[PDB]
Amino acid sequence: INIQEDKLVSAHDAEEILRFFNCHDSALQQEATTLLTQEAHLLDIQAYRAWLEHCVGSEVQYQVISRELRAASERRYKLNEAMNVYNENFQQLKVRVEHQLDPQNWGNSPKLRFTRFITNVQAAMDVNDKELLHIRSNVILHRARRGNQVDVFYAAREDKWKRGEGGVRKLVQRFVDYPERILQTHNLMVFL
Amino acid sequence: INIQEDKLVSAHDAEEILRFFNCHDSALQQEATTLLTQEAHLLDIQAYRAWLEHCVGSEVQYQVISRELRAASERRYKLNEAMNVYNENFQQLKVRVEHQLDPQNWGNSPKLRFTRFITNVQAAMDVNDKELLHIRSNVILHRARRGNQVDVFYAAREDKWKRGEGGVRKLVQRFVDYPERILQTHNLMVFL
Amino acid sequence: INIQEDKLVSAHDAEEILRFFNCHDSALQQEATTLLTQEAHLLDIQAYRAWLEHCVGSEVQYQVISRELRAASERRYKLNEAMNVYNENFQQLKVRVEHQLDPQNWGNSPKLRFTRFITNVQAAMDVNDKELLHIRSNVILHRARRGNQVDVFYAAREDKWKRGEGGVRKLVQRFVDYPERILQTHNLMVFL
Amino acid sequence: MNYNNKILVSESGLSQKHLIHGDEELFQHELKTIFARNWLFLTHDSLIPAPGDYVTAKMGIDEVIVSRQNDGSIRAFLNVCRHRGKTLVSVEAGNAKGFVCSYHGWGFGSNGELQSVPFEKDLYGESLNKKCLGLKEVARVESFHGFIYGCFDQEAPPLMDYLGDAAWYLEPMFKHSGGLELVGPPGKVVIKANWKAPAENFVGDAYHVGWTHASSLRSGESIFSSLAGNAALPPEGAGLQMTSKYGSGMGVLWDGYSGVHSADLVPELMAFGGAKQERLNKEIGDVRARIYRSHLNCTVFPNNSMLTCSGVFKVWNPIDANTTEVWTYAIVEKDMPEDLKRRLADSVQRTVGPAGFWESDDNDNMETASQNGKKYQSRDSDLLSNLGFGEDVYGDAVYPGVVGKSAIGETSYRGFYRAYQAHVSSSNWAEFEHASSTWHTELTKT
Amino acid sequence: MNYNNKILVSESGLSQKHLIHGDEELFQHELKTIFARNWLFLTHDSLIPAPGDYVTAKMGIDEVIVSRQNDGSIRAFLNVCRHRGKTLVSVEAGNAKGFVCSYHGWGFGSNGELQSVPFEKDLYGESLNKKCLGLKEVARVESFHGFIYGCFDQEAPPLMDYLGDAAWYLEPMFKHSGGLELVGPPGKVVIKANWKAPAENFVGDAYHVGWTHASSLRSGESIFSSLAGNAALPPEGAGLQMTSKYGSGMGVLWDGYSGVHSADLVPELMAFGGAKQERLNKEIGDVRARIYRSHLNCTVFPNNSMLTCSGVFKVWNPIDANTTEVWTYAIVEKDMPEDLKRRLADSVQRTVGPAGFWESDDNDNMETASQNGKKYQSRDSDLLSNLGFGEDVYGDAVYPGVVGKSAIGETSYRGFYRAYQAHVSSSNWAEFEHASSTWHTELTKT
Amino acid sequence: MNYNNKILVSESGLSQKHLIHGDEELFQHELKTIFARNWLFLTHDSLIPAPGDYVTAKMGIDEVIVSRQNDGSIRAFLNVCRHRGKTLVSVEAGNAKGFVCSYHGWGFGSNGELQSVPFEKDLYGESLNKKCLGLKEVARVESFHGFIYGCFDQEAPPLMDYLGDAAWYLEPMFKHSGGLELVGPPGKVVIKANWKAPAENFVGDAYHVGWTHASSLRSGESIFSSLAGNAALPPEGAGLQMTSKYGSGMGVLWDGYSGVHSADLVPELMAFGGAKQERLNKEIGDVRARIYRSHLNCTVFPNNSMLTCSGVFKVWNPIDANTTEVWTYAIVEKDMPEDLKRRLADSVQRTVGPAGFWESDDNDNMETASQNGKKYQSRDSDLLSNLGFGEDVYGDAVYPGVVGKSAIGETSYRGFYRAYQAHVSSSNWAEFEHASSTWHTELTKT
């Protein structure tokens, strides 16, 4: 993509297009779909320890940002463009999992209900690190609790996965640029 | 999964994980995706008789429950945990289909519009009954009517499908534990 | 499907069922999924010129209709049943793309955020034109802007794609019958 | 609007202003004059049988905790902490000796008393008067054969008196059958209708059944199936209608023991009901034993409805003028075989629950009728309930209350709305009584 | 708020309080003093040409059924059953001899009369006075060259008088062209703006076009395309503005027959319009034949707008102070070739329909301007409409009404808001007339 | 409701009517008597350091543009065009010399002045008085060590006086530390609570921490972690509470410099804070140097809260009685190493941001407490804030304000609500002052 011509496209977005339009390896697309469907299943049943053990690499960065609304023509104002809703290493994810599982987490009773919808899976091996798998996918995440609370989250995920212990592919980076600037879901206390 | 460690996970949910994490048969995943996409297409165009004939086994149980909100630590109160929004045999499904098709079903004029989104398909053959196929999938179901009524339903489906007349795989059990306790969609008068 | 028995089914809908229930070519389903996922990715990052160049055929008809609500038993009233929200040739799509990219499109600053979810892909080659590919798919399209505006669109798409310049498959027809009669999303200014 | 003077319901209950289904100021007024004043359904003994068992319930827009005490009584309390007002209980049912608030940890007993405060000694010393800080208690809680009702107003009539002439009709099924059980948990769905729309429909509307439910009648093969599409009027003497001083009323459809249940259950039910009736003839007389196995569509004023024999039990919980949260239970006879009870419960939800195909037929009726009450040209229009007027009786030798001796009419609408208007225009029970001293004369004019 | 005294619009219409776009109490007051009083667009002959043809339409927040009678006239009725108030018709258009209610089966004729009641003999006997139970009828229904308007107020001026000086401008296209057809069905979209925001924009706002629509002007290649980004002011004498006693007004852009249509349609349209103008010179004179093929942006007070030549027809249906349901039709000249009519209709929706790229440019303008009327520091602020004030004329020898002889100004805002204020502060038509006896003097001060 | 007479807060601030968290008429009244009257947080120097830098901010429900002028001052203006009232700026931050409206193209300077109008000469001639058409300016804008506040009321006390006795506590961190920077952009989330619920919780609620945050305390390993599940009361002399005349207040937890931060940051922070304290002993004295590195939970009346040392900065932006938009920034000490600043900012959002696991613990507390204020049986109920009453002092030789010399109590609630009630019942600042002339006597009774 020529971002001088395609005026609305970011350099970052153009780089990611190129990664997937080049690759096609249909078996890889299928492996990636399985990986993500299984991950989502673990999360949906709130098997957060299982998720950490089976899906998350020790070197993970799990990052969700919220970008400040700036003028499309802005070129002078240079301060921090985004904040980190999540920017977690493995230990920080573990703290979050322990908080979920603590029997004095009052907000988890009655038990929450999660349903995740994973679509638009794309997969490409890294050019330089032959053991690093790039996976892109979109998620709709539905959270229901306490009779009449329903929150629906929508995001695109840019992942890196790498084979780890036992040859199991695990998440080493997830990046989400959350599309809604002001959240209307009470909080973003869900694993996208 | 160890549900003594993964404190939020139900025994039922742990059993279903084990079923799919074991199997991998990529061709089966594809067959299941086709089956479910075709089923959804029939339902979306309101071909309810075709759905019964082509997709639903004579021995079907079609079940959607709503579970009462109870304390996560509850251990004494033992009364009926859930009610059946649906718990239908084939004849009861047929009654529902006839009600849909009756020309004095006033609520069906003007004609409703359905769009279904099926994701996260997993498939595994039963260990003991080699002709029974377990399929799990999630659905978003959008119903629009009468200008400005829009209802969106979200659920995970645990299905059993078996080859029937003509060798066609048909639904013999569907189980949904509906995630929203108080429905905010007027009714649940849709086939999930 | 017998539409005399399946009373709620339109002749048009019955014709489209027959097209896909006949075909099965699993490789074609995969090619179609790729095509649509890549198209959606281009649109989501607002690479509208790239979309035109890589995804849209010079002979395209891009059509989204809204059908008037009429009695299911109506048989006398014969005036225009639908209006065209979109009914675009390539040049008309190009005008829309230029409007999106114009730096005086004030409504595009701050930059919009799009996330598309494509599901229920089916593909069949045309019987008569061996180079014409029929693809059906459903889309959820999430648009977020200006802090707290969120609009979600839901539709089924009936596409025809044909190999064009460089042997690249491109869209030659898209037809959407939009399911909501009165839009509650401010406008339908999105490419479904 | 001046509710002392505004004629919202005309004399004899013959019409109502359409705005009553749409006006939010009136809805707020009803919270005071209807919901804070009258008896409201809470639960059944069968759902909280053991000490410490509790459920949550709505009373109007308020939420209460309803708890089985150690002495076997039931007490109910606002589900609101006495400290900073957090909701105390976030579940629908359970068993506990008490309830701890998740904000600052105050602990209340099952009896509502403030039993503990964290670090009381160090923080409050002896200064906290815990005796005055118990949960706000529902003033009145009474039972009708295991069905538990509450009332915030200490001045209300006893529940039995409040049921008035309706009680006589309910007793064969509620008492003489050996008693009923409520099968939970309920279905719960929000509809965009005023609470009065389903309340009025259940209290008194047999006229709609053949037309509204044409498709469900034809498709389900139930006992009332000849009505589909108004193909056939019920015969002479097929039933009656009644109403009462405090607004409760019902229709009676003679012998319709299988109710809405599809042909799969009809033979079994008709056998079971008939067998019990044969035994009841000797105990309560032929007429009342027949009433036992006759289908009653009843509203216990204001917002609790039921279909006996069909086994449907409904609460129309008010949210706002065009929003209602519908709770649907099944009621079964305790001495039915367990397998029949199970199938009956499923059939109730199948027909009138969240995916109830019969209840779906009613949705547009109630939603649009309610929403039209907001529309400018309709607010001051008159909803009509004159069917059968001038033919009702009072003091009949066999059937008590204000009675229309026909299966189809609007007798029960008129009594419902007469009571409603008397409450809306009154400041307390004494004023309602004064406004109701000629209630049956008003209903039986012309 | 005391609407008799509160100055919501200043003298000469020069400013308005911003709260008028946000205040819900005022919105409720407008239902009475604007929508229940004035003429509102219903449909066109072309959409209900045959006996029994009907459409549904909104009139304010009310819904009506508009039906072609057997004698060729049109009558309109509230879409509300006279029994228990259910919505009668759930579709947008059709053909029928009558309408049956799905609640209890009451049957009304196309003429609104209550024709049948199920089981009338058995149930009501002779007691139901069906003659008094016809649907609530819209008091006034009149046509302007096939365009059908309704009015709930029997005291309104005839539609022709109500159009006032605006009618003279519309007649070349509406009458002398051979007549127009409305092409349905309309697009329908909800916007989060007050109904007055698009109404005012269409009645009188040429100033915004170059800036708001910069991208659509540049991208579409329409005839007005030199305006993009305020690159060029229209020349001297490029058009005029007008307004009228009862609030209707418009802009006139000389010769702009292809309007918003993209270059694909420009040559064909400019040929067609020019050809007809040449014929009309002889019939109605050069000035009026020129008006025929000149672009008119008009609002027929209160909430019906149009762009002649572009062929856009809009209804701004009020929902609440910050919600409006926008209906978009195409208007075409009956004697155009069918293929051109089809392409014109598609081009209308392409530009200003639900995915109309031009209309999208206006969304944020109207939504934020409306929503800001709710904000505390803005409620009492003054929206300005003083452009061109002191240069308007009345009684001109060539162009009638209060006229600004310039393409760009706020003349039509001032007349719109003068009429609005006169209605809001009046209890009936007689009071509006008294409040309007010096309407043109007020508008032409200074 | 008559706000002059209605006792919404009882004497000494001991209780409040629960309706204050639910009543929409009161919310509208607060827009006038709280938000239009008092100082409200806008931004920090660090977010608009250069000429032409701007941000948007809310002040109550109004939106303002806050702009760095060429002379180094800051001015703020309503984000509303003076023409037809469109929102001027649609972004959150940037740099510009001015702002052009996208409706008709009016151009305003960074100084609010109307600088240009398209085609002014041709359209308005000399008739537009641009000098009177500048953006509506926020009357008062003042800084507290780089933290910029605004006030619509010209009669307000200077910001420093408004902070009252709270300023003394804030100065060690805000001034003597070398100064703080605000790290943007903020997280933004809507919660279904009244703005007062989080405001009161931050101003004065240490009691909830051990119970509400049990899971976060146990899981995060922060410095206050011994509190989990009320396992341990803070020791004697662990802290104090204070409040002030104009409603601002805070808790002080001695030495808790690492605050909510998880064990990963504790050693580094405790080293950094301790090192600076050692230097500050010499400059400001041991007590104040200790306050510098002590955790302060503060609300700057009405709706700006912070946790010093944790580095949390919050704005509770009101939407309606049960809706609040929560803005979350991080505050850091300017002289911290950049890498620590980065990690601190991430840790603030980790703990109390949009996915803040600590703040998630508070959600149900604040939402249900607020929503219960709408429920009929709770509106007139009393929320209690009597903990520690009768033990507060004023004029202490070491710690200023009304002070409770204990870590846990409700002193700061009482002062907050005393000020709130004085504003709600007053028409202007002079009346608030008259209502507050014995403020500390009232708070220290018994």
Ligand code: FES
């Ligand atoms: S609100 Fe319940 S203990 Fe404080």
Ligand code: FES
């Ligand atoms: S409401 Fe229309 S027939 Fe009863």
Ligand code: FES
């Ligand atoms: S509304 Fe801003 S220039 Fe007109």
Ligand SMILES: [Fe+3]
């Ligand atoms: Fe019914």
Ligand SMILES: [Fe+3]
């Ligand atoms: Fe415009």
Ligand SMILES: [Fe+3]
């Ligand atoms: Fe907290």
